[PDB]
Symmetry: D2
Subunit: 189 residues, 4 copies
């Protein structure tokens, strides 16, 4: 079957007061991302929450010299934003729903995502979350190299910069040969 | 720099009433494994506890082995003075706890990433079982280009003949260095 | 449809005048290995010849083994009817030749990618040596989530003790299916 | 030490008459790409030519579309057989995917890769992202990378610097500010 990957939709990346917030454009996808996730779950798909995980003063982390402290373990910054957070409280204990700490941008890097997907004979990944040109993009490239078919939920990905969101969407379609879908998981043309 | 990998030295694998215990041969290495780990830590080495983690019906081990090392259960606790060591130094930045689901410590973990961050060129392997989790970890380290040290008195298997195969494989095929509890090369 | 992996069955590993010969036990599987390969090809399976290739100061085997399987030599040619099979059907789209530098057929190759392109879920392993290149390949396949079949009469080791450790490992640890030269499960 | 990666700078990618041609902007980096590659080689760096191999319209078939463009082809004629110079066939955009690039770099204990070639937002980007995930320091030779569209070239350069923490350098391997 299929797997939906929910990438970094947390307080720190989304909320107005978030430590490394993408701001309004990330907040704007809240309805669509929660909708498509509940739909995927209802359709029997596996759901993988792949969430940035930082410790305070990790001098070996490549991001430590680029970005201010964010998504710290045990803080409110790692909480899922909007109805997605309600969904996790309701269905997080379900065997088809996973929470996965990550340290790189890509959901595959240093995680057991690929292993879990192959156990389940998953051939298609559906990507949602933030940021379109960073974590979503890295995850998409890693999925491409690992031979997965790729679906991108257009109204359920967001970037801080609209120009970067556009580059990423074009890259998904023209380079990765991915399928762009809406919040109802129907193909867009 | 160097990293010591502590593989699956839990109650469920070592203790008498353990759900998938290796028994006496595993218990026999308790003194040596805690000594070598405390020494590695004192030498400024990074310490990685890589521990079997179970919940799931898609696991390959479900059709082979009985339930063991379940998340949250006391079966996942570290055996002997090694458990005491983790209580003391677990909070230190050089010591890590790492859940794994395959035999190899590298498979589906961020072990390689963490080692590369620290520019580690040599891994020091300890734990159980010599011919399973230790062997799988050693082969993955070999393919990832790490130099390998095996602490002979701090690895154990259920079957002595399998322990012997594994030791010979490490030396002759992987070009690993066999060392003692004092981290001195064995000849 | 499945994939058969043919590991290192060359002159230098097998032939009496080979640079690193396994001797009689490797020569003994010559009939079974070419029969099972032809059977796999006939039923539509993909065939992957994964062959050791030496040219290099930074190679890990340089300090452990004498020069063998050198590029452009007769030593890299497939032994027996297996060499005849590649002469006949090497140009077929389902038959592949890939050079490897580690023991495992997966390490630094595009084997996983090629298998995933074809939606292969099961690999069938043949060749030499059972406790080295075959074992490393099997462990990599296991970690990559493949079902594994081992053709018992078409794998060989230098020592019978090592051959038996490896077979046991495949069956008891990896959950692999042991099959005969007709690709039927052995009991 | 360091390794320079030379990505897909062939006739099909660069030349006027080649398939899937990038045209003028790709031709424009010819002087810089050969200059920086020679400098890296003279410094003792390892040189990896990672070249797409085929068997999008048909391009880079295993044919004349795989010869290295310009003075870089002359460099390879002079030093291609040196133990520090490699020719690597690839089937994905990334130079790491399905190759032994990571293995060869680890054997030599390389900590830093220097990326050159085409296209900045495709093969170069995919290679850089893989290098990041494999824990390498990254250098991008700005005047020795190119793409078809300037906006794509600028996105990729911004991504390297701001997201991956790459060092942007010039043709003399000096950091740019
Ligand atoms: Zn972060
Ligand atoms: Zn287990
Ligand atoms: Zn060899
Ligand atoms: Zn191409």
């Amino acid at each position: 079957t299929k797997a939906l990957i929910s990438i970094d939709y947390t307080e720190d990346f989304v909320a107005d007061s978030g430590k490394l917030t993408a701001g309004a454009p990330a907040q704007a996808i809240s309805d669509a991302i929660s909708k498509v996730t509940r739909l995927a779950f209802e359709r029997g798909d596996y759901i993988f929450f792949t969430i940035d995980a930082h410790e305070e003063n990790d001098c070996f982390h490549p991001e430590s010299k680029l970005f201010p402290p964010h998504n710290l373990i045990g803080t409110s910054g790692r909480n899922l934003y909007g109805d997605l957070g309600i969904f996790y409280q309701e269905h997080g204990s379900d065997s088809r729903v996973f929470w996965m700490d990550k340290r790189h941008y890509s959901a595959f890097s240093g995680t057991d995502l690929d292993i879990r997907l192959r156990e389940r004979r998953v051939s298609t990944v559906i990507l949602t979350g933030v940021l379109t040109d960073i974590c979503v993009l890295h995850t998409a490239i890693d999925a491409y190299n690992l031979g997965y078919d790729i679906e991108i939920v257009k109204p359920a990905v967001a970037s801080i910069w609209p120009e970067n969101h556009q580059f990423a969407l074009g890259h998904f379609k023209n380079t990765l040969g991915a399928k762009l879908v809406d919040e109802n998981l129907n193909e867009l043309f």
